[PDB]
Amino acid sequence: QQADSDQPSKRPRFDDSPRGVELHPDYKTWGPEQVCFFLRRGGFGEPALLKNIRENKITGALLPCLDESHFENLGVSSLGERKKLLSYIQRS
């Protein structure tokens, strides 16, 4: 009657849709976007910050050495969000 692996009522549209994902973890060989993803995870981004980490730059290796107002050159305007994004990068 219906092979069931198919398929909902009807679909989302831009002009009526205003306001779980998983995805790859650990660790050091992380493209700039696996860095952007991890940043957005904390509540950061701020496209001005990520507008270009599309590349100045960073590897999944230049995480813990990016220090704190290196962040100044690339967008995050205020001192406080910058202070626990400085301390969002640790924990491992």
Binding site: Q1, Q7, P8, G20, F37, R40
Partner: protein
Amino acid sequence: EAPEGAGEVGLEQWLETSLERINREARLHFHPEFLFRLWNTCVEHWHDRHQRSLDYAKYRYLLLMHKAMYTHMQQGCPC
């Protein structure tokens, strides 16, 4: 034309399932990368910049990547 029937269900778990298994399968076919570029851009574009639903951005992401899988599999893969 034939018509029916009982294709009532989804969005919801349909969306979450679709996204999920298309990702599980797409991780077998692409190399640095990552896929996040699509994902991030979508969550940056429709969700952030036009403040639309996250489900919407995830839907458009889903669409794009179904077209990507289509492309790759039609292109053929040694595995």
